[PDB]
């Protein structure tokens, strides 16, 4: 009530919250095309933006799933009634999102399309989307039961340096 926790501790706890919510959204809206959360606190309100491709699906029928998710978030993180609101925004250039593409590939692999061909197409999609380049690695037991790895690559890529931080979107 009148706590005002440490400036150190508060920032750590905030990031922790942000990270848990990211997981849960990834776990819940996996198939649905989730591409990140962008949270921001305000006076007596905490906006939280879901980024995704299939926005119609995340919202649900007539306004349903978003309302369920707000209620669940309220219940879980100790938020008052009407202190939080989920805002689904459509992702511009979904190809350049790495986690969205990694999901798309997961889906394709689950359906039963060949390990190569689905992964190749995904690669072709991200390069049409307008990237500097790419690196797509599938690994594990690709036929037989001795684990191998695919490694489909193209274009301009970087590994070293600081720049990797902000120049490669990894997933």
């Amino acid at each position: 009530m009148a706590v005002q926790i440490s400036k150190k501790r508060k920032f750590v706890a905030d990031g922790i919250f942000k990270a848990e919510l990211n997981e849960f959204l990834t776990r819940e809206l996996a198939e649905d095309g989730y591409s990140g959360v962008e949270v921001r606190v305000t006076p007596t309100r905490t906006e939280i933006i879901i980024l995704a491709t299939r926005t119609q699906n995340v919202l649900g029928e007539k306004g349903r799933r978003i309302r369920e998710l707000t209620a669940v978030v309220q219940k879980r993180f100790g938020f008052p009634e009407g202190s939080v609101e989920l805002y689904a925004e459509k992702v511009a250039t979904r190809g350049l999102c790495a986690i969205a593409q990694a999901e798309s590939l997961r889906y394709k692999l689950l359906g039963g399309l060949a390990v190569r061909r689905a992964c190749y197409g995904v690669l072709r999609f991200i390069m049409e989307s307008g990237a500097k380049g790419c690196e797509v690695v599938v690994s594990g037991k690709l036929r037989g039961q001795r684990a191998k790895s695919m490694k489909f690559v193209d274009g301009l890529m970087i590994h070293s340096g600081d720049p990797v931080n902000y120049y490669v979107d990894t997933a």
Binding site: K7, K8, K10, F11, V12, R40, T42, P43
Partner: protein, 104 residues
């Protein structure tokens, strides 16, 4: 009323925090009164060193995960309505703003 209102901008990001700080000074100059320039506090470094390894059996190598945290606090000699107009602007980043009433 006029009273010694204190803004306190704390953040993880530097550039974003300084931009906010600058905009609040601009807003204070516009609706002229006073300022007592944005006081850089000594930044803290929230630091965690862990083993890179899950398990024990590599060569023993360590991460040094930092997290910096900055505090720019700004004094002001004004009424409340002007402060609410200023502080409502300069939001969207992770800059935590804490407005104290007077003295302490």
């Amino acid at each position: 009323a006029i009273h010694r209102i204190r803004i306190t901008l704390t953040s993880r990001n530097v550039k974003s925090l300084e931009k906010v700080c600058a905009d609040l000074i601009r807003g204070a100059k516009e609706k002229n009164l006073k300022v007592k320039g944005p006081v850089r506090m000594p930044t803290k470094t929230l630091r965690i060193t862990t083993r890179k390894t899950p398990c024990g059996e590599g060569s023993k190598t360590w991460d040094r995960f930092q997290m910096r945290i900055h505090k720019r606090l700004i004094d002001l000699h004004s009424p409340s309505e002007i402060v609410k107009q200023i502080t409502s602007i300069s939001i969207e980043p992770g800059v935590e703003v804490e407005v104290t009433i007077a003295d302490a």
